[PDB]
Design an enzyme around this catalytic site. Structure first.
Site, PDB file in Angstrom:
ATOM      1  N   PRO A   1       0.817  -1.233   0.000  1.00 33.14           N
ATOM      2  CG  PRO A   1      -0.052  -1.092   2.171  1.00 33.14           C
ATOM      3  CD  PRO A   1       0.686  -1.997   1.241  1.00 33.14           C
ATOM      4  CG  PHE A   2       1.310   3.277  -3.024  1.00 29.29           C
ATOM      5  CD1 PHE A   2       2.433   2.532  -2.725  1.00 29.29           C
ATOM      6  CD2 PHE A   2       0.752   3.184  -4.303  1.00 29.29           C
ATOM      7  CE1 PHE A   2       3.013   1.721  -3.680  1.00 29.29           C
ATOM      8  CE2 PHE A   2       1.336   2.387  -5.267  1.00 29.29           C
ATOM      9  CZ  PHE A   2       2.467   1.648  -4.950  1.00 29.29           C
ATOM     10  NE  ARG A  39       8.685   2.263  -2.619  1.00 30.25           N
ATOM     11  CZ  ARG A  39       8.773   1.037  -3.142  1.00 30.25           C
ATOM     12  NH1 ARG A  39       8.022   0.032  -2.674  1.00 30.25           N
ATOM     13  NH2 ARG A  39       9.616   0.822  -4.152  1.00 30.25           N
TER      14      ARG A  39
END
Lengths: 62, 62, 62, 62, 62, 62
Positions: A1-2, A39
């Site tokens: 996931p971001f 990230r």
């Protein structure tokens, strides 16, 4: 996931460092992502560029 | 509601203030949001970073 | 210029049309963009996906 | 501050609830923001829409 | 590097697959990123939600 | 279609020029869009602002 974070300009490198660390741990806890797949990145928005209720952060004395 | 606005770099503080004011009014009129709940923020995009059909604004500026 | 708008899900087609119309007018007024160069798009955010001080709109809906 | 979270689609309500509360807490800790100033929202990205090394998450069998 | 793509709803899984592949190769060529460090993801925007010159894609018969 | 590109800060003008032209070509190929309908823009993210596994790109010595 971001995770994309938006902050009014002026937080320190240290606070940025804590955003990246804590939001990474949050994403690991919440969704079980391997730490190294997470990230997080941060946009510093200038105070002339951020508005709340139609008034800039600069006007609001932020 | 939130609005994230992308402009080529170089608008003045007052131009950006008018974006904040007028987009906040637009959102209040369109969705009936209370003014104080509306957040607008603006990204200034460098000319070398903005592409229109495969050519940057910097290259189309020359 | 471009505007990316985030709304909690459930606005009608006409509500969204008014966002497109009014934010485009706001941008033309604020930066003098030609109407035809203005792009607006809207993200509908599920209630379970939108957090206000650590609680989702779905949970604050109950 | 605002945090915009991107997840492959398919997280349950409870997982998103954990993303909202943990990310909000993270931001409070990291930049010293009051609870009511932190906004967190999540985008669920379809598996066919999410690319990792030129291959879709669907493609990578997720 | 990351690429976020916005498309009007209705492209096929195949076209999505080609977006992810070609934009991944573009990012590899342009910036030398290791293929496996390149994330590309796609938002499908409904035709009621995308505006060009103040008129929705649905109105424009897209 | 639109493509929003995120890069660690420090790419030269020429590298961004290659990002704009190659991504635009990619999108033309992948969804059959005319050149003039493809918009590409780039965000340069500071090294202290970009997190990979809970550590900044600065921190990871970049």
């Amino acid at each position: 996931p971001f995770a994309q974070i938006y902050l009014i300009e002026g937080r320190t490198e240290e606070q940025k460092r804590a955003v990246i660390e804590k939001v990474t741990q949050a994403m690991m806890e919440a969704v079980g992502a391997p730490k190294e797949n997470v990230r997080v990145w941060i946009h510093d928005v200038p105070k002339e560029n951020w508005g709340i209720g139609g008034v800039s952060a600069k006007a609001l004395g932020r």
